[model samples]
Target: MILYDAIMYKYPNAVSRKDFELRNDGNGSYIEKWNLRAPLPTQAELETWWEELQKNPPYE
Candidate 1:
């Protein structure tokens, strides 16, 4: 089960509000609204972090 607000928690370096747009989907969830800044981590790299999180997530 993916935790709520996991994306932001994991990747806080996004160019928020300047070029990045994490829009609300109106269902109490966020959505990537546009192409974010360049030089982001690879999908495989991100997936590794994700998998690790599920192994032992911190308390909210």
Candidate 2:
């Protein structure tokens, strides 16, 4: 997720890296470390996007 990576990059002290793995047809499936601190945006938070986009707000 772009947002997740951006968050992690922006605030490394607030986050931790661990157990970032995946598998599709796994025998030698491997991936680098990852964070489980997936942010769950609320409905109120999500609604702001619509409001901002209609009004042309910065992505940040």
Candidate 3:
């Protein structure tokens, strides 16, 4: 849920949640997924950075 919260906080509008099946049984269906209002991270870049959270999530 940490990743979700970060994304939600960063985007802050018209959001939804989906997963790559490693977290929950939900969908990654954000209304503004890529967030045209801001620059979205590339898949590889996101995963690499997301690894830090996946390893030792801060908001536990």
Candidate 4:
């Protein structure tokens, strides 16, 4: 997500303010103006994290 934002900031001509704003607000449940992709965890890393969590449950 940081990389994406940096790229947009560096190349404003390539990415518009509206597009950047959409990505920034992608997580908000209330706002429905722009339905952009959520910042997702890398597949392999996410799977590993999930496996670890299954082994060691979080505190309740």
User: How high is each candidate's TM-score?
Assistant: 0.41, 0.30, 0.38, 0.31
The per-model lDDT (C-alpha) reads 0.55, 0.43, 0.46, 0.42
Off by over 4 Å in 2: 1-37, 57-60
Give the number of the best model, judged by lDDT. 1
Instruction: Find the candidate with the highest TM-score and give its number.
Output: 1
Output candidate 2 Cα RMSD. 8.8
Candidate 1 deviation (Cα RMSD): 4.6
Looking at candidate 1, what is the lDDT of residue 15? 54
In model 3, residue pairs whose N, Cα or C atoms come closer than 3 Å (at least 3 residues apart or on different chains), thus clashing, are 18-27, 18-28
Span of ten consecutive residues with least summed lDDT in model 2: 1-10
Candidate 4: lDDT over CA atoms? 0.42
Task: Assess the local accuracy of residue 46 in candidate 2 as a C-alpha lDDT between 0 and 100.
Answer: 43
State in Å the error of residue 19, model 1: 7.3
What is the full ranking by lDDT, best candidate first? 1, 3, 2, 4
Residue 22 deviation, candidate 1, in Å? 2.3
Q: Identify the runs in model 3 with alpha carbons over 4 angstroms from their true place.
A: 1-37
lDDT of 3: 0.46
